[PDB]
Amino acid sequence: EPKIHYRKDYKPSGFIINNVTLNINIHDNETIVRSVLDMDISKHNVGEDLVFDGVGLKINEISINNKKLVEGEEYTYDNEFLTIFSKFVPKSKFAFSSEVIIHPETNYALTGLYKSKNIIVSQCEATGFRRITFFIDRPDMMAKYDVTVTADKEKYPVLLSNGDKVNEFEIPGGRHGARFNDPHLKPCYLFAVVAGDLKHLSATYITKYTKKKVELYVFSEEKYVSKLQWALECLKKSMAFDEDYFGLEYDLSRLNLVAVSDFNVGAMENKGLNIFNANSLLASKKNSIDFSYARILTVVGHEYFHNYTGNRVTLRDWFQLTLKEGLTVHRENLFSEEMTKTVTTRLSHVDLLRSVQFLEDSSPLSHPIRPESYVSMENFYTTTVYDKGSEVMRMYLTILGEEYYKKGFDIYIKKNDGNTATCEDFNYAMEQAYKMKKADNSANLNQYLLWFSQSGTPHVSFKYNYDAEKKQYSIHVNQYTKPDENQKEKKPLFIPISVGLINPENGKEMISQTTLELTKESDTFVFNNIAVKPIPSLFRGFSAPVYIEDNLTDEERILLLKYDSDAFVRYNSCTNIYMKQILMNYNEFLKAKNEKLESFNLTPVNAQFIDAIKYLLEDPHADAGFKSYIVSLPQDRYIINFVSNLDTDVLADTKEYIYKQIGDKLNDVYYKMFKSLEAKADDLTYFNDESHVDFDQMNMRTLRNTLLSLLSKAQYPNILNEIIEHSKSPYPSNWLTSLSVSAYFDKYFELYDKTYKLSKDDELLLQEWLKTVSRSDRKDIYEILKKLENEVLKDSKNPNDIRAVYLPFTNNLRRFHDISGKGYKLIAEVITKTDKFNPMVATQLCEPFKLWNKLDTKRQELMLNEMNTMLQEPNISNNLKEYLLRLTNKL
Ligand SMILES: [NH3+][C@H]1CCc2c(Br)ccc(Br)c2CC1(O)O
Ligand SMILES: [Cl-]
Numbered sequence: 001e002p003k004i005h006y007r008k009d010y011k012p013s014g015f016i017i018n019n020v021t022l023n024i025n026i027h028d029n030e031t032i033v034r035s036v037l038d039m040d041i042s043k044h045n046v047g048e049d050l051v052f053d054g055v056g057l058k059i060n061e062i063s064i065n066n067k068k069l070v071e072g073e074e075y076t077y078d079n080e081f082l083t084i085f086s087k088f089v090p091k092s093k094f095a096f097s098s099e100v101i102i103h104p105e106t107n108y109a110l111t112g113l114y115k116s117k118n119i120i121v122s123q124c125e126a127t128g129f130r131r132i133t134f135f136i137d138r139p140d141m142m143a144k145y146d147v148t149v150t151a152d153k154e155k156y157p158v159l160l161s162n163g164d165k166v167n168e169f170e171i172p173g174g175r176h177g178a179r180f181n182d183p184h185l186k187p188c189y190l191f192a193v194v195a196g197d198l199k200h201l202s203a204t205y206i207t208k209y210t211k212k213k214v215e216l217y218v219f220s221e222e223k224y225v226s227k228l229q230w231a232l233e234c235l236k237k238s239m240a241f242d243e244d245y246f247g248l249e250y251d252l253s254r255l256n257l258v259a260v261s262d263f264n265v266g267a268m269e270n271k272g273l274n275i276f277n278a279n280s281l282l283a284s285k286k287n288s289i290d291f292s293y294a295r296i297l298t299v300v301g302h303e304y305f306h307n308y309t310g311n312r313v314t315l316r317d318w319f320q321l322t323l324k325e326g327l328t329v330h331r332e333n334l335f336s337e338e339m340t341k342t343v344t345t346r347l348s349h350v351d352l353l354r355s356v357q358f359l360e361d362s363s364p365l366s367h368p369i370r371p372e373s374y375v376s377m378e379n380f381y382t383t384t385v386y387d388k389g390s391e392v393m394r395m396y397l398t399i400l401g402e403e404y405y406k407k408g409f410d411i412y413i414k415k416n417d418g419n420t421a422t423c424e425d426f427n428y429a430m431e432q433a434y435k436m437k438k439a440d441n442s443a444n445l446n447q448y449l450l451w452f453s454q455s456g457t458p459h460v461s462f463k464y465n466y467d468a469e470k471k472q473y474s475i476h477v478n479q480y481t482k483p484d485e486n487q488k489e490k491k492p493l494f495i496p497i498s499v500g501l502i503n504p505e506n507g508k509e510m511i512s513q514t515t516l517e518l519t520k521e522s523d524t525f526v527f528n529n530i531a532v533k534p535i536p537s538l539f540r541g542f543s544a545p546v547y548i549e550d551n552l553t554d555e556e557r558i559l560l561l562k563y564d565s566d567a568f569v570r571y572n573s574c575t576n577i578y579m580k581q582i583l584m585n586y587n588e589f590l591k592a593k594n595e596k597l598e599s600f601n602l603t604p605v606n607a608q609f610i611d612a613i614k615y616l617l618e619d620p621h622a623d624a625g626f627k628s629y630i631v632s633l634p635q636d637r638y639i640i641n642f643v644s645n646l647d648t649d650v651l652a653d654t655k656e657y658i659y660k661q662i663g664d665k666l667n668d669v670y671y672k673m674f675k676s677l678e679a680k681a682d683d684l685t686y687f688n689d690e691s692h693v694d695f696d697q698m699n700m701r702t703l704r705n706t707l708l709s710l711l712s713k714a715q716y717p718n719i720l721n722e723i724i725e726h727s728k729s730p731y732p733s734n735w736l737t738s739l740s741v742s743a744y745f746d747k748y749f750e751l752y753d754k755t756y757k758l759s760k761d762d763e764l765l766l767q768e769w770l771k772t773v774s775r776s777d778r779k780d781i782y783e784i785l786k787k788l789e790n791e792v793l794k795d796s797k798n799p800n801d802i803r804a805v806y807l808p809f810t811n812n813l814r815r816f817h818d819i820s821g822k823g824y825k826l827i828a829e830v831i832t833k834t835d836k837f838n839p840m841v842a843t844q845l846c847e848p849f850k851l852w853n854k855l856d857t858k859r860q861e862l863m864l865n866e867m868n869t870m871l872q873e874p875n876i877s878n879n880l881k882e883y884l885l886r887l888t889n890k891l
């Protein structure tokens with residue numbers, strides 16, 4: 001029965017905070033925070049008490065207009081809210097001031113002000129500023145910030161906060177201070193401070209239009225300063241992209257990026273002072289796997305793009321979160337697609353959406369991208385809000401085209417720059433462009449708003465007709481969203497369907513690609529002068545976030561896979577072929593299990609599909625990244641969206657059969673390709689250059705490592721020789737793959753020790769090594785996890801360490817879901833232990849339970865018993881309690 005906030009209840013504050021003047025004085029065993037708030041009474045004031053958020057603060061004194069308030073008589077504080085009785089609240093402009101004590105050195109929850117190794121750092125989104133000092137801690141309370149930080153100079157030579165550094169000064173006793181002025185009004189969740197012995201790389205950027213000089217700095221601890229350069233390159237690329245595509249320039253004289261080792265999320269867009277999980281900022285080619293480079297490009301870009309979509313235009317309230325996150329992910333997706341120029345970039349986003357986000361949207365946690373209520377906002381930084389939000393933001397571009405999309409985006413910025421905004425404000429701007437494109441001032445996007453308010457994944461299904469004498473082709477389309485616990489009645493959405501038509505005789509396009517606008521529950525689209533029966537290429541680029549039911553034969557899907565122009569449709573046609581096979585074999589194994597059959601049949605894999613995989617693999621002009629997708633079955637969390645009461649044992653048996661069906665025909669091709677790809681995949685050009693990344697070459701290594709895994713599982717003759725040579729590669733992607741694939745051989749623990757020694761002296765590489773062990777397909781994985789706990793992880797409270805040890809293992813379909821329930825018990829024990837010092841990470845660790853009600857009856861009960869046991873833990877966090885109550889349909 002928690003405190004629940006509702007979107008419909010929004011109302012402006014009765015107060016105004018115009019300026020914030022902070023003095024943050026860091027000592028070994030306490031930090032003293034002095035704060036002066038220059039305040040006023042708003043037009044919405046009705047004489048209410050003045051209530052500040054303030055969580056876990058120790059009050060030394062509080063004052064109004066430099067007269068101390070008296071506890072009990074004039075205020076009360078209950079460790080969450082400071083209430084000043086209205087009788088003592090002025091009726092015009094006044095100053096509120098306070099001095100509180102906080103303890104970053106024991107703040108293991110990494111919210112508010114905390115210590116990460118030898119760095120002091122803040123994290124204030126969403127509602128952490130109230131853990132530093134008193135505030136009306138909501139994003140519509142925008143103010144200007146004057147921040148002084150003081151500390152021991154030897155321990156903390158670098159002091160940072162938002163904006164211009166206006167003074168530096170020495171203090172008796174070996175201390176010093178620095179003062180910052182941020183001229184841009186901001187909500188308090190964008191405040192940040194950093195103190196540490198930081199080293200940096202720097203550059204000067206000159207903006208495109210106003211020719212402003214901007215100093216760019218990237219910071220880390222001294223040991224890792226050599227890992228800063230790619231992030232700086234990524235920042236320069238991000239700034240140029242926002243200038244080139246959106247015409248947006250940076251608006252301060254300096255921008256700082258800072259890496260810290262202990263961080264709950266990827267990074268944070270604090271104004272002029274972006275703070276990063278080190279794993280999302282630091283890399284070097286000797287000490288990072290390839291995937292670090294796309295991760296840093298993404299996160300550095302994302303944080304930079306927030307400078308407009310989030311900071312200069314911010315949020316009226318937290319229900320609008322997708323307005324900054326969906327939009328900023330979309331901006332980062334456009335950026336990364338342009339930077340990498342690989343079709344796999346878009347494909348990876350689709351692969352993530354249709355696995356983890358579709359799972360979420362059919363789970364008890366399902367919510368629209370603009371939720372209707374919350375208890376802890378930190379539980380709603382979800383793949384729905386971010387990734388479905390991004391697809392909803394991308395649909396605007398698909399509908400409008402680039403020219404009118406840019407026009408609408410510029411309207412959004414112009415109308416809302418410097419202010420809070422709502423999702424409706426964005427839709428309104430897009431609507432102005434829509435009216436232009438349609439040349440119709442009665443056109444509107446009112447229906448489009450359902451994408452913000454309606455939960456659940458739409459299902460879009462197709463039927464076809466071709467009249468050869470008339471040369472007339474028809475596509476009959478239906479949409480359906482399943483009722484859920486948010487709406488028992490669902491409405492049709494505005495679904496853009498990018499389509500082409502392929503001539504199956506020559507593989508050629510038969511129409512100009514066109515985007516069909518489905519706005520009704522069903523529609524028929526007719527095409528004339530279609531000279532022969534086509535195969536339709538549907539939802540090109542994955543043009544709407546939906547379940548696609550193409551009702552094509554496997555023969556037609558093979559032709560698309562081979563000849564279509566659109567990477568997504570080729571990949572999806574392959575996905576659909578696999579799913580048809582998976583569901584068939586799954587049912588065959590399931591019946592044999594349920595009926596305790598002594599003999600039964602399995603349906604073999606389609607031989608023409610196997611031939612098509614071989615054809616694409618052997619094509620020297622086809623794309624290595626795309627090839628790695630075609631030889632992999634769909635993700636387990638994708639598959640589960642199509643199976644009721646999923647028995648994970650039967651699914652594992654199903655995958656095993658299909659992979660071996662294909663390998664028994666293609667392993668020699670796999671081996672030949674693994675060998676022929678080596679020269680180009682592993683070429684050492686630019687290995688000593690952190691300013692250039694070859695994303696195509698990286699995709700060649702991904703393909704090689706995918707093929708090696710398939711060949712190792714298959715026990716291909718003498719493949720251990722290749723694994724051992726692979727362990728000698730300079731590329732960590734390769735030598736960590738050699739550990740993974742050696743799980744099937746007696747050399748596993750030899751390579752475990754070899755790669756440990758290669759990893760143990762770099763904090764981030766060791767975490768990648770932990771992930772590799774955790775995900776190893778070992779029969780003794782439970783004993784290996786104990787080894788990691790006892791020898792490596794031990795008592796670490798570092799979120800990266802804990803997540804590395806446990807989350808990859810939870811994707812071990814056969815072992816995590818052991819029918820004894822021991823894997824559920826193991827992870828629940830970790831969740832409960834972690835919740836006592838880091839509620840956010842504890843809730844992140846709950847991820848495997850999200851599919852609990854989609855599993856077979858026995859596993860459902862096992863998972864539910866562990867969740868209810870977690871709910872019984874004394875002093876459970878609000879974060880974890882809310883999450884588990886919602887997930888078990890109690891909230
Ligand atoms: N505002 C920050 C919130 C933290 C977070 C989370 Br949670 C998930 C993905 C990303 Br990317 C981020 C970075 C961010 O800038 O959105
Ligand atoms: Cl000063």
Ligand SMILES: [Zn+2]
Nearest residue numbers: 302324325328
């Ligand atoms: Zn973000």
